[PDB]
Design a protein around this motif. Structure first.
Motif, short mmCIF file in Angstrom:
data_model
loop_
_atom_site.label_atom_id
_atom_site.label_comp_id
_atom_site.label_asym_id
_atom_site.label_seq_id
_atom_site.Cartn_x
_atom_site.Cartn_y
_atom_site.Cartn_z
N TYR C 97 0.83 -1.21 0.00
CA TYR C 97 0.00 0.00 0.00
C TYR C 97 0.86 1.25 0.00
CZ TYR C 97 -3.75 -3.15 1.85
OH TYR C 97 -4.53 -4.26 2.11
N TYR C 98 1.88 1.31 0.86
CA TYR C 98 2.72 2.52 0.93
C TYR C 98 3.53 2.71 -0.35
CZ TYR C 98 1.80 3.88 5.74
OH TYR C 98 1.22 4.33 6.89
N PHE C 99 3.97 1.60 -0.95
CA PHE C 99 4.67 1.63 -2.23
C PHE C 99 3.80 2.25 -3.32
CE2 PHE C 99 5.88 -0.43 -6.20
CZ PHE C 99 7.24 -0.24 -6.19
N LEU C 100 2.57 1.75 -3.46
CA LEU C 100 1.68 2.30 -4.48
C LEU C 100 1.23 3.72 -4.13
CD1 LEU C 100 0.86 0.66 -7.07
CD2 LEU C 100 1.62 -0.86 -5.24
N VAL C 101 1.17 4.06 -2.84
CA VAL C 101 0.82 5.42 -2.44
C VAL C 101 1.88 6.41 -2.91
CG1 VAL C 101 0.77 6.94 -0.42
CG2 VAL C 101 -0.78 5.02 -0.56
N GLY C 102 3.15 6.11 -2.63
CA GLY C 102 4.22 6.98 -3.11
C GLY C 102 4.30 7.01 -4.62
N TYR C 103 4.11 5.85 -5.26
CA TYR C 103 4.15 5.74 -6.71
C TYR C 103 3.09 6.62 -7.36
CZ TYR C 103 3.73 3.34 -11.27
OH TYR C 103 3.65 3.05 -12.61
N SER C 104 1.84 6.49 -6.91
CA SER C 104 0.75 7.31 -7.44
C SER C 104 0.96 8.78 -7.12
CB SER C 104 -0.59 6.83 -6.89
OG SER C 104 -0.54 6.70 -5.48
N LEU D 8 -3.11 0.77 8.64
CA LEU D 8 -1.84 1.25 8.11
C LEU D 8 -0.91 1.75 9.20
CD1 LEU D 8 -2.91 3.13 4.86
CD2 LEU D 8 -1.99 0.82 5.11
N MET D 9 -1.28 1.58 10.46
CA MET D 9 -0.48 2.09 11.56
C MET D 9 0.73 1.17 11.79
SD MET D 9 0.72 3.68 14.24
CE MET D 9 0.12 5.09 13.29
N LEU D 14 10.66 -0.97 13.92
CA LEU D 14 11.05 -1.72 12.73
C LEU D 14 9.98 -1.63 11.64
CD1 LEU D 14 13.15 -3.68 11.44
CD2 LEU D 14 11.76 -5.54 12.39
N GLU D 15 8.71 -1.72 12.04
CA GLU D 15 7.62 -1.60 11.07
C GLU D 15 7.55 -0.19 10.49
OE1 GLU D 15 3.61 -2.37 12.58
OE2 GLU D 15 3.23 -3.52 10.75
N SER D 16 7.78 0.83 11.33
CA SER D 16 7.82 2.20 10.84
C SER D 16 8.96 2.42 9.86
CB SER D 16 7.93 3.17 12.02
OG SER D 16 9.24 3.14 12.57
N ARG D 17 10.13 1.86 10.16
CA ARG D 17 11.27 1.97 9.26
C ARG D 17 11.00 1.24 7.95
NH1 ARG D 17 17.49 -0.21 10.36
NH2 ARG D 17 18.44 0.94 8.63
N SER D 18 10.33 0.08 8.02
CA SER D 18 9.97 -0.65 6.81
C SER D 18 9.00 0.14 5.95
CB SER D 18 9.37 -2.01 7.18
OG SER D 18 8.99 -2.73 6.03
N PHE D 19 8.01 0.78 6.58
CA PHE D 19 7.06 1.60 5.83
C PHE D 19 7.75 2.81 5.20
CE2 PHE D 19 3.26 0.09 8.58
CZ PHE D 19 3.23 -1.09 7.86
N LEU D 20 8.66 3.44 5.94
CA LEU D 20 9.37 4.60 5.40
C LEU D 20 10.28 4.22 4.24
CD1 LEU D 20 10.18 6.65 8.62
CD2 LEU D 20 8.49 7.12 6.84
N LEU D 21 10.97 3.08 4.35
CA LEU D 21 11.81 2.65 3.24
C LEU D 21 10.97 2.20 2.05
CD1 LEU D 21 12.40 -0.84 2.91
CD2 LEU D 21 13.30 -0.36 5.18
N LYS D 24 10.09 5.60 0.39
CA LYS D 24 11.25 6.09 -0.35
C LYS D 24 11.54 5.21 -1.56
CE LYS D 24 14.33 9.23 -0.76
NZ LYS D 24 13.96 10.67 -0.87
N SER D 25 11.29 3.90 -1.44
CA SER D 25 11.45 2.99 -2.56
C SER D 25 10.53 3.41 -3.70
CB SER D 25 11.16 1.55 -2.13
OG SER D 25 9.77 1.32 -2.00
N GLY D 26 9.23 3.58 -3.40
CA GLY D 26 8.28 4.03 -4.42
C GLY D 26 8.59 5.40 -5.00
N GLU D 27 9.14 6.29 -4.19
CA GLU D 27 9.55 7.60 -4.69
C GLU D 27 10.64 7.47 -5.75
OE1 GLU D 27 10.82 10.32 -1.61
OE2 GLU D 27 11.83 11.54 -3.14
N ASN D 28 11.73 6.77 -5.43
CA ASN D 28 12.72 6.60 -6.48
C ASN D 28 12.27 5.61 -7.55
OD1 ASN D 28 13.67 4.30 -4.54
ND2 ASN D 28 14.96 4.00 -6.33
#
Ligand SMILES: C[NH+](C)c1cc(NC(=O)CNC(C)(C)C)c(O)c2c1C[C@H]1C[C@H]3[C@H]([NH+](C)C)C(O)=C(C(N)=O)C(=O)[C@@]3(O)C(O)=C1C2=O
Ligand SMILES: [Mg+2]
Ligand SMILES: [Mg+2]
Ligand SMILES: [Mg+2]
Ligand SMILES: [Mg+2]
Ligand SMILES: [Mg+2]
Ligand SMILES: [Mg+2]
Ligand SMILES: [Mg+2]
Lengths: 304, 192, 132, 584, 101, 67, 122, 105, 37
Positions: C97-104, D8-9, D14-21, D24-28
């Motif tokens: 979900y977070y991946f597709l959120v940033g992607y979109s 989504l909480m 570790l879960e917060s770091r995984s969500f943040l990475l 950032k993964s989707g951003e790049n």
RNA sequence: GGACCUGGCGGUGCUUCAUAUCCCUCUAGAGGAGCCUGUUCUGUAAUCGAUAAACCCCGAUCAACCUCACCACCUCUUGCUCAGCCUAUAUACCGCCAUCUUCAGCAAACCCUGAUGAAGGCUACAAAGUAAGCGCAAGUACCCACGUAAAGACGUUAGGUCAAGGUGUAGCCCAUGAGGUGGCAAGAAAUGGGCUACAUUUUCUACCCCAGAAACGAUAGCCCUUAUGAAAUAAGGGUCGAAGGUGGAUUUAG
């Protein structure tokens, strides 16, 4: 039900939050303030008031769930259980017994209201038989318990009074007494001012009535209230009018004089003149053209 | 899932701290069981947790009266005050004669290009200009189509140049050159 | 008969929500609008490309969030903040979900040249307003 | 940064770091695809023009052999492409200008004859959170080695430097800095001697590279390297270049590597900073803090200089100057955790709340360590009302607490004797994801069944222990197949008996039987009391049989209690006598 | 990758008229002034007659933005009748009601 | 409504006063009268800038010199 | 809280009138209450006015191919709220207009702000 | 055009015409095989692309899974014959449905 | 212009970050068409 | 073949109604003249679709080119497109609707009656019916609770559109696909609907309803000018002074 209990608890905690939300940390936050606050918080814009947001207690939100009629042994509580209409039939039994012991001694509720009070679906003829039974009890000379029984079944009337609203007489200008009234008919607005004396003088839009109204029908329309009330050459009217046509303007002006001469006439004569039909707006306005037609109600050719 | 902050939060908390920004509903964040919709015949308005219509609502939750009050305690720095120019329209007209019209039209989208938003128009009073007699005669004869008789207001429009500041420049330039050409006496004035 | 946006009654087993349950004659008598853009208001110029961007975004969201958007989207547009509010189910994995959120997020940012904000709402099951 | 949905909480750090990475993964992700296809995003609609929304071009648009192409490839940071067409320029015979040869060797010395990494560097911090209490020296030895490019002899940089005709200060400075960055310390020192022979001037960052190279040189005494640092700064003064904050912070990092003998040199360095007039930074204070704090020091005046530093440092707002200010807050408050000083920790939090020191907190790992040590200290020596106030103020708004922090909460509440908060913090730990923490489970169970409680607390404890047992049952098939602890079993059983869940206690005595764990005598006595209440000789004989099966030395007393307190049939009496004969 | 060849032909008209738009304006003003001699306008008549017959904005047909349909398009959204009906009936387009009055 | 959009500091005379780009011919001529008409039209233009206005003007100058 | 008192006297806006125009009366009057409360604690006289709504009505065919007699009629409800303002400073205009257009609502909003800056003749 | 594309629910409704098939897809699979870290493989933080042999092997595995799914559509189910095949007279419906009053048949 | 739209969606689907059911439908249908026709 | 059940029909009975729908009634028209615009037929090398009520100023809130899919001639082959096709199938469809509807029914799940057939389920002084849900209703919009809108379920007519678009089946790829240039929209005739009239309550002028003067009618044809356009259909003026004497049977609308 536990649903109702935790919903009531949630409503209490939520209305506490909501008063703290807006401005009202004091404990007393009333229902109209709740409605105003939620109206501001979520601006509705929906034409249906039930589709607008709501904050009520779960008693008003949730419907009336009827309690269990039997325990953990079968054995239903009311003796008239197996009729399936225990409240209605118990009521019929009680009224019939009260008639019986009364005889040995010697507006109305609507069906939906009785259904709400009984929490049971009811038939039209069942409600009619109940009403006939209560009418029999009323026609029979009955005691006070019977009377309060009839009165807890009877409701209010909310009668309307239909005396014409008399505008105040404002003593103004230099030294003269007048009333300023308004009239509307067929997209024409006419506001008029009549002074008590002046022997009859009309000032439509700054000119006289023989100039603004060259038509004798329009002049007759102007005459009509004064000739009905027999005060023809006694008053004077200065009027300003916007929009419409000659007859719409004449009618709006006439309505204005009638609704100011109401203030300048006695109450019996203004009831008489209302009966004559001068104090009521004519709601007859132009209709709309429709798609697929040739006018308001006129249609096209061959359809049959 | 998790037990939400709707029942985790308690009374006496700061809603400006909870919602800073204009945001859609987020019913888990909202401590209010908001029910939306036309109910079914033997039912209630539908619940809070999943309401597309509650997300569609413009959601004025982030602006509560205490938030306006505290926020403008923050904004009270960014203001001076007026002089004693008075509520009187003739007083402020005497103090500051000309009146210039220059507005904006705010859209919402990608671009901020509303061309008509450059429209500018100047209204000035001859009774405040105070220095025109045969110049005011010549002035009216120049600008016949404006200057209605009832009020002594001269209204000159500009929509000829793309920028608002040079539209204002066109307005003040027309004011000064109409004034100068009105005061410039011409040789054919006597043969009227 | 009118067949515009009215789901028909089969026999009583058809889960259906408020949106596609309500008919187009209740369009703001009961429903409201799914997309809030000021383009269709009386003085404005760009409403046509507003609408083609609306249909682009709705089909894009349906295609890049595969089988998780419960019902239709809330497309709001205020200033240059475009807001995509979603009602997505709880069946995939939150990193996805977070991946597709940033992607979109940044795809729509570089396509529409505006700040685009994805605001998600997770639901367990497709909500049912009535059964048709 | 996270969303507002409870699903989504992130529950743990570790879960917060995984969500943040993942974000950032989707951003790049889209950065790569958009820079791969820039034709689909050339249509700009936004006004004014936004170059940082405009896609970036990484392919060289200049194809002919030219200095403009060299500058374009240098700006695009294509190391091999720039080197190859510089060789093409040399083959063509075009005289390549001094500034662009300088820029080419800048790129070569910065990147070490390699391309820039395609991944934006966020890695090399993936240490497990279960090894934060042991062997910091070997942790330093295996974590201070970033796998950077070692300076290879006869690289493209040295080839360009030998080929270029007129060497200057910029090229020599770049080469010394690149050699130091790629760990050619002796070569950089020799090139500095060549610079001094060639009569050129070295700038500030080159001098700091030289200081770092002299310190990182092998097999020399701290006295000799300190004399070398003094000689280098004398050379800097003779070359009239002014030292600065980064200069003296490199010096302070070097003496931090130089340990105990460099404390008075550190004091002299900071005094010389205040004498010259350059403001020491948070990273300056970080370097002296981490120098003076060493394990094995029995004096702690090196920890009283922390109070000195803060007596200098209260009430000031700061700006970014030096990368180690997050390390400053982390290291100073590590001093707070080492010293157990509540007033100094509160002074640290006050300095934090002054201004943008909340921005000076820095990364998420440093923030987690900071607040974890803070709330450990708060639970260690504060009163329970302000500890729970800090609990609701910080958790989970600021950070996600760790299992050591939870057992420290339990220790604080046990010392407090305010045990009514146990179910609430238990529910908080479960919602934060500490469900499978066996140490937390054991601690809550022993603190929870230690004492007799009011019945509402008993039934709340019954609910919590039932959920603990549910989690223990609902952990299926993992490699850490943790057997049911005997203490945890005894505590759950005692809680269930105290709250009246006797049938649950009997079935989990069956669970005692299947896991072969020795029950406790207090539990067996509570079972005898429950059997007295229920009037069940069969259950009394059952638990006596369990005691005899484990051959516990209280079985004779349990039997004597059963005969004294129950009306027993003769065959059950014979069975009990046989069990006593077997145990005897 | 278009709706149809007609809409591709139309967007060719749009582009190439937009780029052959300026000179057509200039000498169409040279048409519809009455200042110049008739033959000095005639030479211009042959050069506009030689200007290509796909950039003259008389071939511009306002087809729908979404699906190629010539007649039955409302300009304010460039939408055809029934596609506008589609969107306004699902309520994905704000402000439009059902007109009951 | 005017973020950016400088138009290189044209400042009110380049847009509407086009004598300096008019480059006066014999002013009694029909060419000069047509130039007055075009100058007034380009002055009434708010959408074109001074650069397009002048480039249009010297397009007319070039064509008139060609004829 | 940076201020930067710079150089030049005020631009003197008299009657900044804000026309807030949308699809939704509840949005319009909630925004009215918001802005009136804001200007009330600011200390600037804010006044309210209701220009009459305009409804843009039009007609489309219902069937795809035939049946012109059966048509669907659509309408736009465009509703004005005039929030006229007098006696406010240029800097105060910047800050008040700032916060107003920042917390402007969604697609149910437009705001035409008419500024009458006074100035002196020259 | 992408704009005139339409949903598969509508497409299958129109195709089947009953009023008078994408579950075998993971979320990040494409034929070029630009496998990402967020999709397909879990979140080393390294972007990469598989080889031609891996791509063709993966698509061959997907296709053979597709013909396996087709076979597990078209098995033959065994119906016991009642008095004849294609009849109903000896067909055994199950045990009667359990009664609402806690009753089993 | 429709080229950025259609070709960007073509690319992104074939990337696998987009799932277009219309194109999936014609892909399966044309697979069956090349199978029998 | 015998006897039924259900439905439809009946130039089928009784009773009660319809009210602009049933008649007697009330008003204004069509059908008679001219013009405009569709359609049929003829014609052309020259689209297609609608075609009792529910086609006939219908797809079109609209064709000089464009539109355009028609024709003539000449060109293009991985053709804007991981092609396309306006190729056939509305009796495969989705999509959006017409009609009954200017209706009130349709009904999941049960239960009962009929020796457990198809089927049926009515009596309030009550004989087996109970009902979730859709619809009417209710609630909304406009100016009111009135009226007009909207809304009107299941199904009927295989009712309308593969040509809005999407699309299953069958076909093409030297074609039925693609592009360029030029033409196609004419009446021996007939018919549907509108517009204007055949005048005296009329006509022209001023006024916009207290006058003066007559004692008629083309928005058709031809000429000139203008608007827009590359290239005239529209507008104005000039010119002309048609047929026409209030229209049978039948019929429309309120
Ligand atoms: C000849 N009949 C058996 C027929 C056949 C088909 N379709 C086919 O059998 C053809 N099937 C193939 C082409 C092989 C796929 C048909 O499709 C049709 C009809 C009937 C027509 C009648 C049409 C008629 N109109 C067009 C003149 C008509 O007057 C009516 C009416 N009641 O008013 C119709 O019923 C009619 O419109 C109609 O719908 C027909 C068909 O649909
Ligand atoms: Mg068989
Ligand atoms: Mg047909
Ligand atoms: Mg063809
Ligand atoms: Mg219909
Ligand atoms: Mg209707
Ligand atoms: Mg209704
Ligand atoms: Mg048929």
């Amino acid at each position: 039900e536990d649903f109702i209990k935790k919903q009531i608890e949630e409503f209490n905690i939520g209305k506490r939050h909501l008063a703290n939300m807006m401005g009202e940390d004091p404990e007393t936050f009333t229902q109209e303030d709740i409605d105003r606050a939620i109206a501001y918080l979520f601006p509705s814009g929906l034409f249906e008031k039930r589709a607008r947001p709501v904050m009520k207690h779960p008693e008003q939100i949730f419907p009336r769930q009827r309690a269990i009629q039997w325990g953990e042994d079968g054995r239903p509580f009311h003796y008239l259980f197996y009729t399936g209409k225990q409240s209605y039939y118990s009521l019929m039994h009680d009224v019939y017994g009260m008639l019986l012991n009364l005889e040995k001694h010697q507006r109305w509720l609507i069906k939906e209201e009785l259904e709400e009070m009984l929490v049971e679906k009811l038939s039209d003829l069942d409600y009619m038989q109940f009403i006939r039974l209560l009418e029999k009890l009323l026609t029979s000379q009955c005691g006070a318990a019977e009377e309060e029984f009839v009165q807890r079944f009877r409701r209010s009337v909310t009668l309307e009074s239909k005396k014409q609203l008399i505008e105040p007489v404002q003593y103004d200008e230099q030294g003269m007494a007048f009333s300023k009234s308004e009239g509307k008919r067929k997209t024409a607005k006419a506001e008029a001012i009549v002074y008590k004396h002046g022997s009859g003088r009309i000032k439509v839009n700054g000119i006289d009535y023989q100039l603004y109204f060259p038509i004798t029908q329009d002049r007759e329309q102007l005459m009509f209230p004064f000739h009905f009330v027999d005060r023809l050459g006694k008053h004077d009217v200065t009027c300003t009018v916007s929009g419409g046509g000659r007859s719409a303007q004449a009618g709006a002006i006439r309505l204005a004089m009638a609704k100011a001469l109401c203030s300048f006439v006695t109450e019996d004569e203004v009831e008489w003149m209302r009966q004559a039909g001068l104090l009521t707006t004519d709601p007859r306005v132009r209709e709309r053209k429709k798609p697929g037609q040739e006018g308001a109600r006129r249609k096209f050719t061959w359809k049959k | 899932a998790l037990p939400p902050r709707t029942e985790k939060m308690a009374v006496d908390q700061d809603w400006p701290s909870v919602y800073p920004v204009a945001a859609p509903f987020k019913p888990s964040a909202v401590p209010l069981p908001v029910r939306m919709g036309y109910p079914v015949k033997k039912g209630v308005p539908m619940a809070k947790e999943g309401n597309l219509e509650l997300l569609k609502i413009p959601n004025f939750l982030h602006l509560t009266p205490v938030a306006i009050k505290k926020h403008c305690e923050a904004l009270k720095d960014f203001c001076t005050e007026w002089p004693a120019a008075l509520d009187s329209d003739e007083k402020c007209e005497k103090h500051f004669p000309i009146e210039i019209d220059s507005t904006d039209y705010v859209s919402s989208g990608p671009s901020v290009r509303n061309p008509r938003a450059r429209v500018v128009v100047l209204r000035v009073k001859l009774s405040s200009l105070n220095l025109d007699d045969h110049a005011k005669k010549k002035l009216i004869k120049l600008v016949g189509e404006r200057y209605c008789k009832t009020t002594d207001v001269l209204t000159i429009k500009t929509d000829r140049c793309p920028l608002r500041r040079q539209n204002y420049d066109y307005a003040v330039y027309l004011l000064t050159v109409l004034y100068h050409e009105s005061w410039n006496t011409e040789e054919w004035e006597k043969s009227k | 008969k009118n067949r515009a946006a009215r789901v028909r009654v089969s026999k009583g087993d058809k889960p259906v929500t408020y949106e596609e349950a309500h008919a187009p004659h209740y369009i703001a008598h009961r429903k409201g609008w799914l997309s809030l853009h000021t383009g269709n208001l009386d003085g404005e110029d760009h409403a046509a490309e507003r609408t083609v961007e609306d249909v682009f975004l709705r089909k894009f969201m349906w295609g890049t969030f595969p089988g998780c958007l419960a019902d239709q989207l809330v497309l709001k547009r205020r200033g240059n903040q475009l807001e995509i509010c979603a009602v997505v189910l709880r069946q995939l994995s939150p990193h996805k979900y977070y991946f597709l959120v940033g992607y979109s997020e940044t795809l729509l940012s570089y396509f529409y040249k505006c700040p685009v904000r994805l605001h998600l709402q997770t639901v367990p099951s497709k909500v049912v307003y009535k059964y048709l | 940064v996270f969303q507002d949905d409870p699903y989504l909480m992130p529950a743990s750090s570790l879960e917060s770091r995984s969500f943040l990475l993942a974000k950032k993964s989707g951003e790049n992700v889209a950065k790569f695809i958009i820079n791969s296809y820039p034709k689909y995003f050339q249509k700009d609609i936004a006004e004014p023009h936004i170059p940082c929304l405009m896609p970036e071009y990484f392919e060289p648009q200049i194809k002919d052999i030219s200095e403009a192409a060299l500058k374009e490839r240098i700006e695009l940071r294509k190391v091999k492409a720039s080197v190859d067409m510089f060789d093409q320029l040399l083959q063509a015979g075009t005289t390549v200008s001094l500034e662009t040869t300088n820029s080419l060797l800048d790129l070569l010395c910065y990147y070490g004859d390699q391309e820039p990494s395609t991944d934006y560097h966020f890695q090399q911090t993936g240490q497990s959170e279960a090894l934060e209490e042991e062997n910091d020296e070997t942790s330093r030895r295996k974590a201070g080695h970033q796998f950077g490019v070692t300076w290879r002899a006869k690289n493209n940089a040295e080839r360009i430097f030998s080929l270029m005709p007129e060497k200057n200060e910029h090229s020599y400075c770049t080469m010394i800095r690149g050699m130091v960055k790629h760990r050619a310390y002796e070569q950089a020192l020799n090139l500095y001697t060549e610079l001094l022979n060639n009569r050129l001037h070295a700038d500030v960052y080159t001098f700091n590279a030289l200081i770092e190279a002299t310190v990182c040189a092998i097999n020399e005494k701290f006295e000799e390297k300190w004399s070398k640092i003094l000689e280098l700064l004398r050379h800097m003064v003779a070359q009239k270049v002014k030292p600065n904050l980064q200069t003296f912070n490199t010096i302070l990092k070097c003496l931090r590597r130089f340990h105990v003998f460099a404390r008075s040199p550190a004091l002299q360095v900071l005094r010389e900073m205040k004498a010259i007039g350059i403001e020491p930074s948070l990273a300056t204070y970080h370097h002296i803090i981490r120098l003076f704090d060493q394990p094995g020091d029995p004096l702690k005046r090196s920890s009283f200089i922390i109070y000195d530093i803060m007596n200098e440092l209260m009430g000031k707002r700061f700006s970014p100057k030096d990368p180690d200010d997050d390390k400053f807050f982390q290291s100073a408050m590590s001093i707070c955790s080492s010293l157990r000083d509540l007033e100094l920790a509160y002074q640290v939090h006050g300095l934090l709340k002054t201004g943008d020191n909340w921005k000076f907190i820095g990364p998420d790992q440093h923030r987690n360590f900071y607040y974890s040590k803070f709330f450990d200290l708060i639970c260690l020596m504060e009163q329970i009302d302000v500890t729970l106030k800090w609990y609701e103020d910080l958790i989970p708004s600021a950070y996600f607490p760790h299992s050591q922090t939870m057992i420290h909460l339990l220790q604080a509440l046990d010392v407090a004797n305010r045990l009514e908060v146990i179910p609430k913090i238990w529910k908080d730990s479960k919602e934060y994801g500490h469900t499978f923490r066996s140490d937390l489970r054991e601690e809550i169970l022993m603190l929870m069944a230690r004492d007799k409680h009011p019945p509402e607390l008993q039934v709340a404890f019954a609910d919590c222990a039932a959920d603990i047992k549910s989690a223990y049952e609902s952990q299926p098939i993992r490699q850490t197949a943790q057997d049911w602890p005997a203490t945890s079993l005894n505590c759950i059983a005692i809680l269930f008996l105290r709250a009246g869940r006797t049938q649950e206690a009997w079935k989990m005595l069956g669970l005692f039987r299947k896991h072969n764990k020795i029950p406790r005598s207090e539990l067996l006595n509570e079972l005898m009391d429950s059997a007295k209440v229920s009037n069940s000789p069969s259950q009394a004989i059952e638990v006596v049989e369990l005691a005899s099966a484990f051959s516990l030395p209280i079985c004779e007393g349990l039997t004597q209690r059963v005969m004294s307190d129950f009306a027993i049939n003769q065959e059950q009496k014979e069975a009990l006598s046989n069990l006593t004969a077997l145990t005897s | 990758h278009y709706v149809d060849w007609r809409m591709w032909r139309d967007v060719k008209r749009r582009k190439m008229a937009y780029e052959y738009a300026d000179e057509r304006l200039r000498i169409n003003s040279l048409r519809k002034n009455t200042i110049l001699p008739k033959i000095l306008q005639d030479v211009a008549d042959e050069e506009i007659a030689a200007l290509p017959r796909d950039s003259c904005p008389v071939r511009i047909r306002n087809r729908c933005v979404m699906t190629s349909r010539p007649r039955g398009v409302k300009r304010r959204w460039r939408l055809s009748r029934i596609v506008f009906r589609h969107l306004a009936d699902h309520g994905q387009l704000s402000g439009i009601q059902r007109a009951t009055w | 409504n005017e973020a950016g959009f400088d138009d290189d500091g044209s400042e009110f005379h380049e847009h509407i006063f086009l004598e300096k780009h008019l480059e006066s011919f014999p002013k009694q001529g029909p060419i000069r009268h047509f130039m007055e008409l075009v100058t007034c039209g380009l002055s009434k233009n708010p959408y074109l800038s001074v650069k397009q206005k002048v480039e249009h003007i010297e397009w007319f100058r070039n064509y008139f010199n060609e004829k | 809280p940076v201020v930067t008192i710079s150089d030049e006297p005020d631009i003197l806006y008299k009657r900044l009138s804000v026309l807030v125009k949308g699809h939704d009366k509840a949005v319009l009057d909630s925004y009215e209450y918001f802005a009136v409360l804001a200007a009330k604690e600011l200390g600037i006289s804010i006044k309210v006015h209701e220009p009459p709504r305009k409804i843009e009505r039009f007609t489309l065919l219902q069937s795809v191919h035939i049946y012109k007699k059966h048509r669907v009629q659509y309408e736009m409800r465009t509703l004005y709220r005039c929030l006229e303002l007098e006696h406010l400073t240029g800097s105060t205009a910047d800050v008040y207009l700032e916060y107003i257009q920042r917390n402007l609502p969604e697609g149910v909003a437009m705001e035409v702000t008419k500024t009458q800056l006074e100035q002196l003749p020259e | 055009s992408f704009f005139t594309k339409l949903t598969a629910d509508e497409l299958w409704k129109g195709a089947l015409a009953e009023t008078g098939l994408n579950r075998g897809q993971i979320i990040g699979e494409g034929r070029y095989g630009f496998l990402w870290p967020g999709l397909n493989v879990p979140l080393v933080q390294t972007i990469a692309q598989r080889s031609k042999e891996e791509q063709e092997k993966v698509e061959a595995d997907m296709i053979q899974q597709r013909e396996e799914w087709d076979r597990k559509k078209k098995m033959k189910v065994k119906r016991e014959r009642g008095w004849s095949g294609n009849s109903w007279g000896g067909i055994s419906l199950g045990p009667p449905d359990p009664g609402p009053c806690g009753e089993t048949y | 212009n429709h080229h950025t739209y259609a070709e960007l969606m073509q690319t992104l689907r074939f990337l696998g970050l987009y799932r277009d059911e219309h194109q999936d439908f014609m892909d399966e249908q044309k697979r069956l068409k090349k199978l029998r026709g």
